[PDB]
């Protein structure tokens, strides 16, 4: 965890903790979702978020919960560092079959089935290994941009 990433989680903690007392309760979760447009947010969704913690969601409990789910989270500059080492001549997005072979043949984390799941929402270019960069974006901030 770099310090600017921890400051981003402190700002997200303050936007969900609308009572500003330092502990995100279930009313803060529901009022942050209602301010984003969720008028139908069920109480069972708020209870499942609180069921991931053993205590009240203060800043260090929110940081330890996000730490334990993001144990391989990598910032965009280090993902582009590794993709610039995979394309060491610069500019070009690397081939689809080169990333499939190098993921498998180096590591067990790069096994195929997982490579079909990589192509599956990370579209073609991304999946193929040709573009580059959009995948670094969606690994640090999810969903389609």
């Amino acid at each position: 965890f770099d310090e600017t990433e921890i400051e981003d989680f402190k700002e997200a903690f303050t936007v969900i903790d609308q009572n500003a007392d330092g502990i995100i309760d279930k009313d803060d979760l529901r009022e942050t979702f209602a301010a984003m447009g969720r008028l139908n947010v069920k109480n069972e969704e708020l209870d499942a978020m609180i069921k991931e913690a053993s205590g009240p969601i203060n800043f260090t409990v929110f940081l330890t919960m996000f730490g334990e789910k993001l144990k391989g989270a990598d910032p965009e500059d280090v993902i582009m560092g590794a993709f610039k080492v995979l394309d060491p001549d610069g500019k070009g997005s690397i081939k689809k079959s080169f990333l499939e072979e190098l993921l498998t043949t180096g590591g067990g984390r790069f096994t195929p089935e997982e490579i079909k799941n990589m192509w599956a929402a990370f579209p073609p270019d991304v999946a193929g290994n040709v573009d580059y960069k959009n995948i670094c974006y969606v690994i640090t901030h999810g969903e389609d941009a």
Binding site: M36, E45, K69, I79, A82, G107, A121, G142, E143
Partner: peptide, 24 residues
Amino acid sequence: SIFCIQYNVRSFMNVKHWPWMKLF
């Protein structure tokens, strides 16, 4: 550089389905 890549992806696969993350 792999690991970085390794873990980094995994995040997303988990997150991308999370309310809070879509919101963000």
